[PDB]
């Protein structure tokens, strides 16, 4: 049996292949393989990911020639080192994460050879910048659903941590499959070299900024900042009046001075203090 503390380790490399292939053909359900490295009865490690040419419909998506599969794995053994189809994934476009009535069927084909084929959903729409609604699954027997017997024999307080969505609960969870808690394998091998490689620049700051127009832009804000302060020479004057909780609901048609009047003060500061300081270092450094 299982302990519902399965803890699927994935990587820091596979998920970018997951989302790029998932989003380049997003409204169709694209899918692929999971090529990883098995460990003990509890955990599993999926390290590499590749897709195949597919043929789809609106509600269904199939695969094509199987030759593609064996020839791809031969070339990945000879270059790098050999592995094994950890599992398989697919991509609900903007749905969420569940096993539909056809998604459950090819899972049933894959769980026969190895019983631990991990079924993975990636949604490349719901993922904005933070959360990436992934939620890997695996089947449970509908024979024990007939028995009314509750499976998986909870022997650790690590399963019931993440709560399922109600929309995935409308679907087959939890009558034919279960969820798995996952995290990410992170290391200085990779974590240091995506941070210190992505957002970097070279001259954007040792340079000046359109020197006749920066001082011109120091009037393009201040000119309407007069009349915006005239509204601030207006709105305080109608206080000691109708209970300023009313002055929250009422003022939603037009812009207030008070919040907008500290908005430009930050802008009229950092545009000046940066451009003044960066000019006064080139006097020292350059002769």
């Amino acid at each position: 049996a299982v302990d519902t503390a399965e803890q699927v380790y994935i990587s820091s490399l596979a998920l970018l292949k997951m989302l790029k292939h998932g989003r380049a053909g997003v409204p169709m359900e694209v899918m692929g393989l999971m090529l990883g490295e098995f460990v003990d009865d509890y955990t599993v490690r999926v390290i590499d990911v590749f897709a195949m040419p597919q043929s789809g419909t609106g509600v269904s998506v199939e695969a094509v020639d199987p030759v593609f599969q064996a020839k791809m794995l031969d070339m990945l053994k000879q270059t790098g080192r050999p592995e094994m189809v950890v599992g398989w994934y697919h991509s609900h476009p903007g749905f969420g994460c569940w096993l539909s009535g056809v998604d459950i069927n090819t899972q049933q084909s894959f769980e026969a050879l190895s019983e631990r084929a991990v079924a993975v959903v990636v949604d490349p729409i719901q993922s904005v910048k933070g959360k990436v609604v992934i939620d890997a699954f695996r089947l449970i027997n509908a024979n024990m659903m007939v028995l009314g017997h509750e499976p998986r024999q909870t022997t650790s307080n690590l399963g019931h941590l993440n709560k399922p969505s109600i929309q995935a609960l409308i679907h087959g969870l939890n009558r034919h499959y279960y969820s798995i808690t996952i995290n990410y394998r992170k290391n200085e091998l990779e974590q240091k070299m995506l941070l210190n490689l992505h957002k970097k620049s070279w001259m954007e700051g040792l340079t000046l900024q359109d020197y006749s127009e920066h001082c011109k832009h120091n009037e393009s804000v201040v000119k309407e900042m007069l009349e915006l302060a005239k509204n601030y020479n207006k709105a305080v004057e109608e206080e000691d009046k109708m209970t300023p909780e009313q002055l929250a609901i009422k003022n939603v048609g037009k812009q207030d001075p008070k919040r907008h009047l500290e908005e430009h003060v930050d802008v009229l500061m950092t545009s000046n203090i940066v451009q003044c300081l960066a000019a006064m270092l080139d006097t020292v450094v350059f002769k």
Partner: protein, 73 residues
Amino acid sequence: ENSEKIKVNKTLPYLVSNVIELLDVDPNDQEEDGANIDLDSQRKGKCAVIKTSTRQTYFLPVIGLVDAEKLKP
């Protein structure tokens, strides 16, 4: 078995509708494998458009079982 499965999914409740137009455009250009779909843009025959009394209009890429030459607008 195929005709039997058809009859299975050929249940007795049916949606009435009337013909609007029978579309015939080319397949798109150009298609690739990877995320291919044998359904969308792989030929020129044949498509059409219809409307149930409930005022809906869906695009058919696939004709279905019967032929359409017998049909018309």
